[PDB]
A paper describes a structure:
The enzyme acetylcholinesterase (AChE) catalyses the hydrolysis of the neurotransmitter acetylcholine, and is an essential component of the central and peripheral nervous system. The molecular recognition of AChE is intricate and typically involves multiple transient binding sites, aromatic interactions, or non-conventional hydrogen bonds.
To investigate the binding of CV, we determined the X-ray crystal structure of a complex between CV and mAChE, to a resolution of 2.4 Å. The initial, unbiased Fo-Fc electron density map clearly defines the two CV molecules binding at the entrance to the active site gorge of each AChE monomer. The two CV molecules (denoted CV1 and CV2) form a dimer that effectively blocks access to the active site. The dimer is not linked via covalent bonds (i.e., non-bonded). CV1 interacts with the protein through an extensive interface involving arene-arene interactions, electrostatic interactions, and van der Waals contacts with residues Tyr72, Tyr124, Val282, Asp283, Trp286, His287, and Tyr341. However, as a consequence of the ligand binding, a significant shift of up to ~3 Å of the protein backbone/main chain in the loop region comprising residues Tyr72 to Phe80 is evident.
Author numbering:
A (entry chain B): 4 to 257, 265 to 541
B (entry chain A): 1 to 257, 265 to 541
Amino acid sequence: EDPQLLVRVRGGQLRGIRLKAPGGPVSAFLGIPFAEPPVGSRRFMPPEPKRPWSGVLDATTFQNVCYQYVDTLYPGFEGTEMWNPNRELSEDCLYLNVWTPYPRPASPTPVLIWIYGGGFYSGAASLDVYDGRFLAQVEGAVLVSMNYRVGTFGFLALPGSREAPGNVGLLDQRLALQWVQENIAAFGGDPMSVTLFGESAGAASVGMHILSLPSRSLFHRAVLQSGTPNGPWATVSAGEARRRATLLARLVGCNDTELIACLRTRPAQDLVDHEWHVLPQESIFRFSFVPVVDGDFLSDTPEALINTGDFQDLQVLVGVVKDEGSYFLVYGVPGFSKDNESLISRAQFLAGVRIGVPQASDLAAEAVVLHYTDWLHPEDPTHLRDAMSAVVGDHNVVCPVAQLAGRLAAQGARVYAYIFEHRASTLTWPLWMGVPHGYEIEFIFGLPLDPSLNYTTEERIFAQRLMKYWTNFARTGDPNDPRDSKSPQWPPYTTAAQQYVSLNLKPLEVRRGLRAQTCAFWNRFLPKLLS
Amino acid sequence: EGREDPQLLVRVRGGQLRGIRLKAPGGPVSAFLGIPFAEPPVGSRRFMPPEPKRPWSGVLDATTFQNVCYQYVDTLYPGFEGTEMWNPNRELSEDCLYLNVWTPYPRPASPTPVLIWIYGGGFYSGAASLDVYDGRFLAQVEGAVLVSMNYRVGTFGFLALPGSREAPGNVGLLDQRLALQWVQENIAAFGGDPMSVTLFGESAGAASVGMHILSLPSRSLFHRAVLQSGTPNGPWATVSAGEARRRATLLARLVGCNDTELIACLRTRPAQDLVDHEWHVLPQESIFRFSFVPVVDGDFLSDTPEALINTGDFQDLQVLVGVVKDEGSYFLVYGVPGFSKDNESLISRAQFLAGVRIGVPQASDLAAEAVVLHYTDWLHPEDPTHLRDAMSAVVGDHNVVCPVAQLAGRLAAQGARVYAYIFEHRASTLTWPLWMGVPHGYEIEFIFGLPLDPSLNYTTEERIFAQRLMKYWTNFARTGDPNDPRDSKSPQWPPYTTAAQQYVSLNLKPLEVRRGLRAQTCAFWNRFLPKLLS
Ligand SMILES: CN(C)c1ccc(C(=C2C=CC(=[N+](C)C)C=C2)c2ccc(N(C)C)cc2)cc1
Ligand SMILES: CN(C)c1ccc(C(=C2C=CC(=[N+](C)C)C=C2)c2ccc(N(C)C)cc2)cc1
Ligand SMILES: CN(C)c1ccc(C(=C2C=CC(=[N+](C)C)C=C2)c2ccc(N(C)C)cc2)cc1
Ligand SMILES: CN(C)c1ccc(C(=C2C=CC(=[N+](C)C)C=C2)c2ccc(N(C)C)cc2)cc1
Ligand SMILES: *[C@@H]1O[C@H](CO)[C@@H](O)[C@H](O)[C@H]1NC(C)=O
Ligand SMILES: *[C@@H]1O[C@H](CO)[C@@H](O)[C@H](O)[C@H]1NC(C)=O
């Protein structure tokens, strides 16, 4: 047996596996349990710590994926399938993964913890895009990723009940963070240098750990890629969550205790079958079961918590891809398709705005339409299509990110910001979608270093830069290379100068103001309109 | 007759006139000044529609300008050309309904396209005798026949008790119409062509031209129109009947006064008493608002200009319309705290928010909020230079640029040939501070060709420029097309259309075609802000 692959954590002994990365080997410990399986009577309940086990637990293979929607619309289409479960589904899914250098690091090593996205209804830490071997092998990082419960299983809430209090999916993530604190030193990891990073719902999750005090003792730095805890999709009120749970119960044949009991009798796939049917409006970029403002995990709305919080001793990296909104249009807006250019009419544009801004009044939707129309080409289908994409991306990601950045920076945080502008040469989504939601991730994780993946040389070199930025941030709270070139420097985001950088094949370029005029509209004016 | 110059004697419907031979830089022109076209609207005629001048006997001397209609005179800045060039330059009187005619000398042998100028001044001031409206250059250089009339302003021109016999409103516009009619009947005596008449005017004068386009009885009196920095639609050029009634009733109270009794009492007040109080009846603290303006009476204006431009057939109308680069700057020093002509007028964010309420005086809190958020630069929300300039743009866009863009849009969509410009040259002689840019009113001296007078110290470039402009305007008056049919070489001026939205820059450089008349911003003013009002 290889000593390198044998590790004792508090629960018992594990055996991992030597994996091949392009530059040499890494030690990988996959499918480590961190919670009692949340099954039967534990459905909807907070996670409990995993009981100690005997002998040597095999940790050479990924565990099951938490029960979720599986996309079948386009069999064999990489653009969808790459996000689908790549192991069997099960409610028994609370496992985490650890990659380290081989041999184990000599000194304590900064740790990166990945929290995946997928609208809080989907995702797994086992997807190929989340493979930690490149970061471990090239940058020497200890990289951790956990499964957390998604959909009803993870966020169905009857607020105030003891058996379905909500947010148990975020409690799963927190327990995984507790586990890293307790155990990661045995892998060569430094528990005193832990960086969370995540994308979309994963980024929103990261932000919710920033805003939830018991999580703050578990990490030191944070990265939010294309998502935020604030904004229109990442949380619901207690009353809306109650409504959604109650309707879903009705839809599958069911006081809180009796209602949750009957829910616990239903096959997992019955809940997934009706998951979406409880959304109040015809919408896109809306997910039925998400974190709930409970007065507990979230003491208040994220909007309220980022406005009033002290973020003095926090470092944060945040950013967006060039085309945040395009991916979502094909899931609900008539006229849009992955299989044609989706050149839409003006009528389709006004109808699309109601779907992409589902909570907007007639008057508010009117303001959006008039702001995003180009009045020199008010009927040009191509402008209208690109405008539809912009409406959804700004409302849901870019302006919530600008809002968070400025609030953090103003209240003491050290903030770095980016826009990612390179379209992967290998993308199977059509060209009109540009740089879609989620297609920076593979570069950050360093997938282009895998020659068999048929990326370009430029892309390999790009990925190495991004791995450096991110691991420099994790080591130091600053993405800049602490000695090497130099330059141009990546400056901190501030309210005065509002500087951010472009991440693309050319060298860093510093820009100022993140959709400043347009996010003023979303962030300062439209709210005055509801009010 | 007998020993007089025989080429200066002329008969019109009311009798014989003697004009005067004037010197223009390049030669003589004929001028017939101070021709009466109405009975003096004095005494019991105050506030009433004009009556046509009854014929006179003998030869009326028409060699000097007549009285200016009774109005406010600006006295704030002793010896300041910037205000003084606009002030009355002849005696103030209610007896003021005269017009002026310039032609070549000798008079033209064949019928000659006529231009009629309608002055601005917020409907509370102005005169056809100001130096800046001098017809001699257009007459001499382009062979134009140019007419300009006085029309009543302020209370005397626009005070209304709508529905009354004695003060029906809009009599100032009727003064203008009477002059147009006078031209139809009489201009042929001077060699003008009554079948080719182009109105042009600036600010309230442009708004006036617009109202003649929109009032059916005026339509037979002209063929083509020019609207410089003004429109009949928009926030300032008209009031409702209700609001005009309110303003006249308040004014009456303030000077110590059944409509008949009320109006009768107003007619006993000294003219200067009315002038002394006319500004006191405005509903809000404001700039670019005037108490006594055309009223939507359901007569001269059958409906609001907005409704009329939205639904009118304009198929056989040619129009030329435009703006100066800085429409709003001039109005800020008249009542937005923080602005002066005598300093750079850098302002704070607080003064900007305050100024937006004064400059958009009918905006609700939410509307004002939308304005401030649109015009704020969020990379530099506190920069006092950006804020000063934004204040100016708010006031300019709201009052002129976007009303002009609405007008151009509707006319183009509803059959008219439209030509649009922006005028971007600042007179080397301007006495207003530099921060004001090209302010409201300061294209006019170039259109009338003042720079051709060497004694005015304009540059050579400005003299060449004035000549280009005099050609655009007079080609437009002749053909409905500003383009020179012989200079096919020079860059062309395309029509404004809804599909391409082309307009040109007027400056020292050759014509440049641009697309979209402040298109995004005017979408806010013209499409969104109204939907908010509801
Ligand atoms: C109009 N209406 C009531 C709808 C419309 C669509 C759905 C969707 C659905 C999901 C799972 C299903 N089963 C497992 C049987 C069946 C349907 C759905 C929604 C969003 C989505 N994505 C955004 C990926 C994918 C699928 C449900 C109700
Ligand atoms: C990847 N991609 C572009 C997709 C993927 C999935 C869908 C939707 C869908 C497809 C197959 C289903 N089953 C086999 C059960 C259930 C739902 C769907 C979503 C919304 C919707 N409405 C809002 C009416 C209707 C259908 C659409 C686009
Ligand atoms: C606040 N308030 C009650 C006001 C404010 C300003 C005035 C103005 C005024 C004019 C002439 C007067 N007399 C002949 C005695 C007296 C006052 C005035 C207004 C505008 C203006 N311009 C825009 C040029 C010039 C003057 C009157 C009342
Ligand atoms: C040319 N220029 C920049 C001007 C011109 C006029 C004024 C105003 C004024 C000046 C002299 C007056 N008289 C000699 C009778 C009466 C009123 C005035 C305007 C507004 C106002 N308020 C809004 C209170 C008060 C006074 C101001 C600036
Ligand atoms: C794309 O395809 C869908 C259906 O497959 C269709 O409804 C839509 O009109 C198409 N769009 C274009 C631009 O052809
Ligand atoms: C200029 O105008 C007046 C001075 O009368 C004052 O209120 C304003 O603050 C001044 N602004 C400057 C000096 O920038």
